[PDB]
Write a protein that binds this ligand. Structure first.
Ligand SMILES: Cc1ncc(C[n+]2csc(CCOP(=O)(O)OP(=O)(O)O)c2C)c(N)n1
Ligand SMILES: Cc1ncc(C[n+]2csc(CCOP(=O)(O)OP(=O)(O)O)c2C)c(N)n1
Ligand SMILES: [Ca+2]
Ligand SMILES: [Ca+2]
Ligand SMILES: [Mg+2]
Ligand SMILES: [Mg+2]
Lengths: 814, 810
């Protein structure tokens, strides 16, 4: 008998959610339809009837709890202790407060659909309970003494969230009201009703691409946490900035970025101490039914990927919704892990102004047509339960009418109205840091020569690309800058060149040489820090995270590195919707750096190109800086200029692979100490040697590693009639420097743009059209030397690659 | 109290025994790890506990209590909680012969060639007898084919020891081999059945092939009349998908693809997943690659059973592979096998993996391979004699010599028009409702207007599309059309499926064209679905479907072309380049709603400039038709041309309801696709081509606005020529048309898109070089260059649009 009871307890805890009354529409009738002497028997010693009543109340009323999939027993125990108790009914005051939030939420919706045209698509009607729910989340975060709640959400109810959650005045929200308002960021202050705390509340900008903002929000919150010295990189472990992420049911189940972002939730490089997720589950996706949208019971099942607790709650019960919101915040604070709230509700209107939703979902909309709103339902229920008197209900309807008038009236009143050069001692310090190992640290035998070579380079020169990068980042840290660098295998470097983190051969302990530069020789901190991580195997979420990190902390140097530039197309949505366009669309600024290894080396179409042509196509005046440096010193100056220029603008860098180890691609100490970034470079024989520019009749214009091959062919054949000029900064085109450089070769009769990439790729598609237009006296007659146009970045054969490369060199010198 | 502790103990093993199972061959985590003769309800507690420890805490970690279906939990419980009969000596020797072949292959690959370390299967060889068991069990069920998708690790070993490709084929001109497709036949060793085994092509982008494989299998399943769109529920084409641990946890496409597993439009009857879990991703440790216990935790999204298996136990690995196939057959749902193993070598030739993972590699350095381990284990247990072990080693040696010798020996050596009757039949089909069907009051006028357009003309875009698809079905073609809200259409224009107002039953008017008037089938079919809210998986699936059935007409529709960038990896790695890279052909159609209408930067552009940039001769067809009839002929040409080539179409939004954008019946019955269109006043009216001094070249809906301005101002001096086919550029038709306007003094390319977008970036550079006698001096009229596809303000949009029209006629 006691064995059947234990199995019955487990059955309610595991599967009671399959029988909970969570759907306000009750669309599926089969949901519910599909001994007595044992009830008074005692089984802590409690009667079976009391055990069963606690289980039905906790798991089979208006909240479906999914938590037995959680692997941590202490988390399962924490939930079952809070859920399996006799809960004290809310005070009438708390019920009246929740009703006032529904009053404000519904008053906003009535106004939005009555005053303006084309607002049906944004309607929160049938889902208004999300407002007292969000209110409870933020109020509970303030109760925990947290610093800020950052929200990311799509368009549904966004202006309602601005007014009733962020607390933006109507004068600001409806100022010159057309749709861009549905994409902009916002900031406000939430002041507790029944408490004495306040908390900052912000909303991040986003495109119409559903869920694409998810990893952006995480990076933004992480940057804010790092600044407050809270969380993973902080002294305190309160993670005092809370991500509050809203979603729609169809998008949450279908978009891959959701799983990529959930995958970041506990990573040392990306954790934000747990995100509070709210899915506005109106059980429809435009005209699409959930059966065509997902292959699982709930739209939230993806959250089981990280063992997150899931609460399915009935949107027509705002008390249960507010209670679950507060429980979610307490779980997040206790375990620093994500909590998912699935609010079952409905979409009162069609998807947009034209849509009659009974055309495609007649059964659902015949049931929706019998529904009174959550506010009228909650007021009527409170009257029935004997919770409020007829007078108190009339006062509630008066408060609703007052809110409605206030928004109409207020909107009516609104209608009436630099050097980057460092001293040599900085280079020496960064070099010495590579040999300043912790006491008893055991360096891997193959890493030790790298550390010694770096000390040698810092004092004697011949500085390679990999060290030049760390000299730039280390000098920024010494000057007080926060530097965050990440990507796939970025700590060591894909080409075993970086070693930003070195690993103890015996203990596995990590040592970060550049972190020593965060402390001055006197011992005081510089205010700077080096944060370097290996990312998860993701492009979409990792790029979105780094973009959001730079938005969150504009003073940080933020770099994301692709394993090979060819994989960055996995993050195309972030490049198109945020990086390249966020500034022009929303006035949102980012200084994020994307490092994209690029170059034709015969390793195939997925290990050759960062798609220079695509980034040049996205570019417009002042949107991004695009570069392909050919020397370590120039890369050093490019990064230091980027971090010190006081301009928040993304930087795209096409970085080398084999050129990392090209013995000709090295720089002198004086290039770091007495020079600056050069958008255009000339051959050293003309700037520092005995070369004669006046002998040149053929000018080769190029970018990147092909320069060294062209220079080696020029040297082999003693071709004084040919000069090679490098365009280091591809965008904005350095018009003036390019004009000035070309003027010093007066006997040029022919000019060629030379590139490794196919004719429909690389810089030619844009340069071939732009250069003869911006500089007609220099580039009229400009011809191309490249690989033939191809549907792939390169051939799949290393043999075909070598022949094509030799054809380019032979044509250039033909 | 005693019995109560026993039930709680049974539940703990079933729920959490996998946390204590000896699954890791390396045993990296050390922290991982009397009353018993009393009978319980009748078995002794010691025998109850032994069954539980063997089932859940030995070399297999079973995760199944998260499954919501109780019959699935029961089915697993019953097969895993039994005293299992030890495999026959013939089976153990067979598993060892597969490990022998697998290891001999690896020794050869790493000894003969340079640069093969990155693809080494050393430490993970047990995946070969595991895959062998999967395919053998599929053959035992009498299934038709197993289609594999995998990344590069052990790919050539799979070709030789699974697909059964000869060494002469594998090492011919020997890295493109690591990406190509392959087909073979698997013949059972101890059975009398055979099964086809194929491998699909893939880029280096890990997991990107996942939805491609599902689409390819579904196309094959539809062809064999099996599964969702078939007579039997066998789903006799099985997807076998391999993965790496870091990519399976980090790539979003995995979740998007798992999300398709039970959908009516995308289900393949369950996929068998094998994760080669070597507990590393290049230099990255699992604690930096995922936020959960297992790399396979994403599979809990669809309640899939998960089996964590020790790669050093090939018997347990082969047993789990067979159980997985039985589960898939019983429940038509995905099964995930997490094979714990190790990566013996560095990620590549340069890598000393102890630089970044010294503890793991000091433990790997003590490991003998799973072959030497399994041979020694078979001697110790007394399952094979010393002689049989020597023969087993003689078999390895013999397999090694054979591959060296065979590769050594290798080194030495049409009209698209339809008739009036066809148009009328498609119009009439819209009114041929099933008995007792109740049409929605707002859908009924659409059905009656279509009958009216079929007989009287003024055919709009939406009907012209269905006229093209419907006529192809009547001719016997399989038409598969899908995308977000595609059944109704995003702009409420398609109504390819209509819903009974009273019962909710779906009716597909075009499906009536799959049956001849005599009652016999045409062989054609209309498969139309609302997709999940995915771009990456949905586009990958449709691409895969076109590969799987080259005779099918496959169309994927973006809600707005602006969202197709979510599928950029599929566009770049498969659609635009699969033919040139792997010789893999696809006739997939992408329909991208496009046009400047003031709805913002995410509801304006399908990024024409990006598709034109990807294009190279013979890779794709790119079009932006301006008339319903020209769109009809474009789709008909595409489906009937006998060429497998992707088609990119920039489709209208407001132009769907533009009263001037309608076609006559004669445009369907007596014309063809026109790559270049002239104004009807010159081809059919009283317009004089010799009066023209200014030529406006354009594409798409802006034509109607330019024509309206011409008509308002009676501008006989200006002509508007449309480029309907943007790629390949219709060079001969363009020259021929322009030669008909001899007094042209100036030419302009006119477009709605910003100067750095639309067709201008490519046309501005390409038109003066391919046709210098016509386009030298070509000038642009467009929106200014922008970092976004458009302004976010409808007011700015209107001003800019008027500026374009005023410049064109200035
Ligand atoms: C990435 C992306 N794909 C497609 C769309 C087009 N779209 C807009 S709303 C919608 C349906 C959304 O359903 P759901 O996520 O349940 O949200 P709801 O509108 O019901 O609140 C789609 C497909 C989009 N905005 N973003
Ligand atoms: C989409 C994508 N991103 C990045 C890479 C680069 N890459 C190649 S192998 C590797 C690590 C793979 O780890 P895992 O998935 O565990 O497979 P394994 O090599 O261990 O078999 C990465 C990140 C890739 N090929 N594809
Ligand atoms: Ca800057
Ligand atoms: Ca074709
Ligand atoms: Mg929805
Ligand atoms: Mg791995």
């Amino acid at each position: 008998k006691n064995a059947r009871v234990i199995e019955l307890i487990a059955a309610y805890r595991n599967r009671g959610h399959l029988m909970a009354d969570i759907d306000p529409l009750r669309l599926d009738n089969t949901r519910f339809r599909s001994t007595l002497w044992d009830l008074d028997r005692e089984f802590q010693r409690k009667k079976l009837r009391d055990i069963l009543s606690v289980l039905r109340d906790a798991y089979c009323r208006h909240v479906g709890v999914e938590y037995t999939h959680i692997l941590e027993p202490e988390q399962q125990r924490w939930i079952q202790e809070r859920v399996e108790t006799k809960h004290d009914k809310p005070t009438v005051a708390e019920q009246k407060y929740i009703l006032s939030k529904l009053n404000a939420a519904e008053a906003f919706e009535t106004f939005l659909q009555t005053k303006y045209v084309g607002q049906k698509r944004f309607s929160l009607e049938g889902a208004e309970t999300v407002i007292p729910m969000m209110d409870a989340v933020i109020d509970q975060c303030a109760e925990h003494g947290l610093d800020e709640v950052v929200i990311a959400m799509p368009h549904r109810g966004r202006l309602n969230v601005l007014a009733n959650i962020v607390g933006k005045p109507y004068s600001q929200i409806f100022s010159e009201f057309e749709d861009v308002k549905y994409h902009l960021g916002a900031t406000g202050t939430y002041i507790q009703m029944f408490g004495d705390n306040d908390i900052e509340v912000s909303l991040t900008a986003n495109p119409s691409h559903l869920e694409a903002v998810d990893p952006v929000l995480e990076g933004l919150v992480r940057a804010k946490q790092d600044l407050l010295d809270t969380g993973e990189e902080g002294s305190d472990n309160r993670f005092s900035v809370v991500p509050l992420m809203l979603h729609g049911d169809a998008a949450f189940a279908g978009q891959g970025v959701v799983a990529e972002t959930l995958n970041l939730a506990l990573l040392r490089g990306y954790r934000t101490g747990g995100t509070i997720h709210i899915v506005v589950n109106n059980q429809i996706g435009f005209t699409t039914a959930p059966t065509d949208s997902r292959s699982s019971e709930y739209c939230t099942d993806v959250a089981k990927m990280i063992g997150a607790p899931i609460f399915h709650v009935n949107g027509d019960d705002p008390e249960a919704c507010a209670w679950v919101a507060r429980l979610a915040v307490d779980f997040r604070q206790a375990f620093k892990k994500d909590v998912v709230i699935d609010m079952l509700c409905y979409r009162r209107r069609g998807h947009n102004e034209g849509d009659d939703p009974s055309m495609t979902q007649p059964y659902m909309y015949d049931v929706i047509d019998t529904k009174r709103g959550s506010r009228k339902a909650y007021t009527e229920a409170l009257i029935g339960r004997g919770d409020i008197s007829m007078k108190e209900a009339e006062d509630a309807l008066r408060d609703y009418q007052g809110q409605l008038e206030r928004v109409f009236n207020e909107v009516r009143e609104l209608e009436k109205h630099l050097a980057t050069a460092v001293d040599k001692a900085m280079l020496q310090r960064i070099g010495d840091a590579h040999l300043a190992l912790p006491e008893g640290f055991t360096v891997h035998p193959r890493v030790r020569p790298v550390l010694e070579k770096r000390r040698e380079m810092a004092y004697e020169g011949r500085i390679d690309w990999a060290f030049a990068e760390l000299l730039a980042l280390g000098s920024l840290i010494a000057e007080g800058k926060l530097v965050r660098l990440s990507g796939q295998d970025t700590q060591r470097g894909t080409f075993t060149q970086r070693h930003a983190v070195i690993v103890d051969r015996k203990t596995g302990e990590e040592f970060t040489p550049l972190q020593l530069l965060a402390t001055n020789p006197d011992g005081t901190p510089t205010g700077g820090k080096f944060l370097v991580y290996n990312s998860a195997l993701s492009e979409f979420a990792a790029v979105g995270f780094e973009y959001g990190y730079s938005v969150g902390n504009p003073d940080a140097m933020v770099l994301w590195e692709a394993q090979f530039g060819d994989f960055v197309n996995g993050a195309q949505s972030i490049i198109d919707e945020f990086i390249s366009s966020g500034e022009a669309k929303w006035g949102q600024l980012s200084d994020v750096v994307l490092l994209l290894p690029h170059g034709h080396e015969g390793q195939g179409p997925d290990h050759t190109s960062g798609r220079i042509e695509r980034f040049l196509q996205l570019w417009a005046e002042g949107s991004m800086t695009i570069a392909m440096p050919s020397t370590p010193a120039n890369y050093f100056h490019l990064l230091r200029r980027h971090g010190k220029d006081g301009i928040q603008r993304p930087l795209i860098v096409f970085t080398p692979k084999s050129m990392l180890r090209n013995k000709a691609a090295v720089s002198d100490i004086r290039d770091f100490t007495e020079s600056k970034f050069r958008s255009v470079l000339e051959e050293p024989m003309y700037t520092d040697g005995e070369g004669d520019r006046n002998k040149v009749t053929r000018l080769l214009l190029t970018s990147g590693k092909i320069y060294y091959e062209l220079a080696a062919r020029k040297a082999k054949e003693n071709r004084e009639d040919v000069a090679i000029v490098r365009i280091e900064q591809l965008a904005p085109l350095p018009r003036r420097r390019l004009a000035e450089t070309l003027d010093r070769y007066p006997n040029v009769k022919e000019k060629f743009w030379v590139q490794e990439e196919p004719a429909n790729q690389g810089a030619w598609p844009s340069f071939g059209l732009t250069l003869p237009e911006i500089l007609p006296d220099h580039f009229t007659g400009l011809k191309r030397i490249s690989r033939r146009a191809m549907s792939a970045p390169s051939s799949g054969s290393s043999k075909v690659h070598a022949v094509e490369q030799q054809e380019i060199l032979d044509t250039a010198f033909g």
